[PDB]
Amino acid sequence: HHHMRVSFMVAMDENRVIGKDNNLPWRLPSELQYVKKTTMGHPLIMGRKNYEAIGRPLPGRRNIIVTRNEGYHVEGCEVAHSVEEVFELCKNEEEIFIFGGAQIYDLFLPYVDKLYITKIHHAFEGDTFFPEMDMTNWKEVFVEKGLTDEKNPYTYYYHVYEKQQ
Amino acid sequence: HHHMRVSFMVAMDENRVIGKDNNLPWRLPSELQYVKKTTMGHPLIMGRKNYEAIGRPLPGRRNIIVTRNEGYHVEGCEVAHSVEEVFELCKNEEEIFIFGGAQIYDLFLPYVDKLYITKIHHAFEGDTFFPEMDMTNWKEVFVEKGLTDEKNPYTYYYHVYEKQQ
Numbered sequence: 001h002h003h004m005r006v007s008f009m010v011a012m013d014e015n016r017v018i019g020k021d022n023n024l025p026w027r028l029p030s031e032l033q034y035v036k037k038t039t040m041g042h043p044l045i046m047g048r049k050n051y052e053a054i055g056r057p058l059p060g061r062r063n064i065i066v067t068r069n070e071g072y073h074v075e076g077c078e079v080a081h082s083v084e085e086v087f088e089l090c091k092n093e094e095e096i097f098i099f100g101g102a103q104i105y106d107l108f109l110p111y112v113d114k115l116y117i118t119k120i121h122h123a124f125e126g127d128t129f130f131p132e133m134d135m136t137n138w139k140e141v142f143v144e145k146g147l148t149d150e151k152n153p154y155t156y157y158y159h160v161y162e163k164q165q
Numbered sequence: 166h167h168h169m170r171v172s173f174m175v176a177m178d179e180n181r182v183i184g185k186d187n188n189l190p191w192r193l194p195s196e197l198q199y200v201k202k203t204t205m206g207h208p209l210i211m212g213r214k215n216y217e218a219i220g221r222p223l224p225g226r227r228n229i230i231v232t233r234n235e236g237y238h239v240e241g242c243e244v245a246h247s248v249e250e251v252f253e254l255c256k257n258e259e260e261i262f263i264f265g266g267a268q269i270y271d272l273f274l275p276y277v278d279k280l281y282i283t284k285i286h287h288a289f290e291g292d293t294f295f296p297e298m299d300m301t302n303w304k305e306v307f308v309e310k311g312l313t314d315e316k317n318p319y320t321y322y323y324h325v326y327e328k329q330q
């Protein structure tokens with residue numbers, strides 16, 4: 001029924017960890033730079049918790065915050081309360097990026113068409129996870145090694161998967 | 166329609182600069198060494214401007230110059246005036262290397278199967294750029310750090326991408 005491409009944007013470790021104590025467990029500026037380039041000009045869909053850890057709208061993109069709170073407001077951001085409201089808000093969009101965290105990934109999981117996933121080759125201590133996915137009907141359409149250096153201290157790969165349908 | 170592998174050979178910086186004042190903006194002998202090793206025994210396809218900055222044929226390879234000039238001639242070099250003429254000239258070749266500059270990269274962009282790209286981690290002053298590429302259905306199949314030393318004063322990586330089709 002929806003016509004925008006629903007894409008996931010996530011970074012995770014070898015045990016699917018995405019978060020620790022409501023924060024990112026790793027510092028990877030180069031990964032962030034890849035994320036900004038890929039998502040620029042497209043809506044970001046993020047969970048209330050995810051957003052408040054940032055505290056500020058990300059420029060050049062519609063920032064849409066998903067919460068059950070019907071009186072929740074933040075300047076420079078739009079607020080949705082469900083999958084369907086997000087779909088209404090993004091009716092005419094080309095592609096939207098589901099941007100985390102876990103609760104919001106779970107929420108949008110039945111509708112994902114494309115998966116932009118960074119895989120970090122390290123086992124972090126974590127408390128928040130990227131949900132399991134059945135990859136049957138999914139094709140890897142892009143893979144490349146991320147930049148490892150003194151500013152980016154882990155090995156990691158950018159992966160993109162597309163659903164076949 | 167064509168049977169030869171069409172490969173790009175290019176070095177660019179972090180903003181896609183490949184040229185300044187009809188020349189290379191950097192001196193990297195080690196990068197040249199990798200280029201000669203990789204392209205040896207295979208045709209080089211070069212734009213007229215690119216070639217004249219060199220002024221002489223590169224040994225051990227067919228040098229093919231692309232120009233609109235129907236009376237253009239250079240000793241020890243072959244001359245093509247279109248994509249199709251290059252294809253005709255290279256119909257039996259296993260792999261040809263599109264060797265620059267930008268106008269010629271643009272020209273052969275719809276037909277590229279393999280991308281040999283050096284990425285230089287520096288922002289040069291430039292006037293000539295490597296075209297944007299949609300890398301969907303491309304996979305990185307090789308990546309290695311280039312030699313940084315007193316003779317090669319920048320950080321750079323060799324990348325190879327292959328089209329999946």
Ligand SMILES: NC(=O)C1=CN([C@@H]2O[C@H](COP(=O)(O)OP(=O)(O)OC[C@H]3O[C@@H](n4cnc5c(N)ncnc54)[C@H](OP(=O)(O)O)[C@@H]3O)[C@@H](O)[C@H]2O)C=CC1
Pocket residue numbers: 009010011012018019020021022023024046047048049050051053066067068069080081082083099100101102103104105107128
């Ligand atoms: N590595 C990565 O790619 C990323 C990692 N992260 C990490 O993830 C963690 C945050 O994830 P998580 O704790 O899951 O929190 P979320 O970001 O998923 O936010 C959860 C909130 O979303 C709202 N929500 C959840 N379900 C619904 C629903 N069905 N309808 C309406 N609103 C809903 C609720 O808001 P409310 O309570 O206000 O009602 C809930 O509290 C952090 O550690 C963060 O650093 C986040 C993004 C990316």
Ligand SMILES: NC(=O)C1=CN([C@@H]2O[C@H](COP(=O)(O)OP(=O)(O)OC[C@H]3O[C@@H](n4cnc5c(N)ncnc54)[C@H](OP(=O)(O)O)[C@@H]3O)[C@@H](O)[C@H]2O)C=CC1
Pocket residue numbers: 174175176177182183184185186187188189211212213214215216218231232233234245246247248264265266267268269270272293
């Ligand atoms: N960093 C790198 O990997 C490389 C960088 N370079 C740099 O790039 C710059 C040169 O690039 P650029 O200025 O784009 O010049 P090009 O090498 O792309 O040559 C342009 C010329 O090619 C011919 N040409 C262009 N389009 C066509 C066409 N459709 N049909 C037939 N002939 C055509 C024309 O020749 P004519 O006028 O005779 O008709 C045109 O003037 C230089 O600075 C060089 O150093 C070059 C190679 C590699």
Ligand SMILES: COc1cc([C@@H](C#Cc2c(C)nc(N)nc2N)OC)cc(OC)c1OC
Pocket residue numbers: 009010011023024031032035050053054058098099100116117118
């Ligand atoms: C850049 O802006 C940020 C974004 C996020 C977000 C995310 C993400 C995110 C990342 C990092 N990588 C990928 N591949 N996908 C994602 N969805 O939550 C962790 C947190 C940040 O710091 C608290 C950010 O810095 C202000």
Ligand SMILES: COc1cc([C@@H](C#Cc2c(C)nc(N)nc2N)OC)cc(OC)c1OC
Pocket residue numbers: 174175176188189196197200215218219223263264265281282283
């Ligand atoms: C070696 O022979 C040369 C070739 C080029 C060519 C190129 C290239 C080129 C380079 C350097 N690196 C990569 N990764 N791809 C390319 N396509 O145009 C700039 C210029 C030269 O000096 C004027 C060369 O020395 C005689």
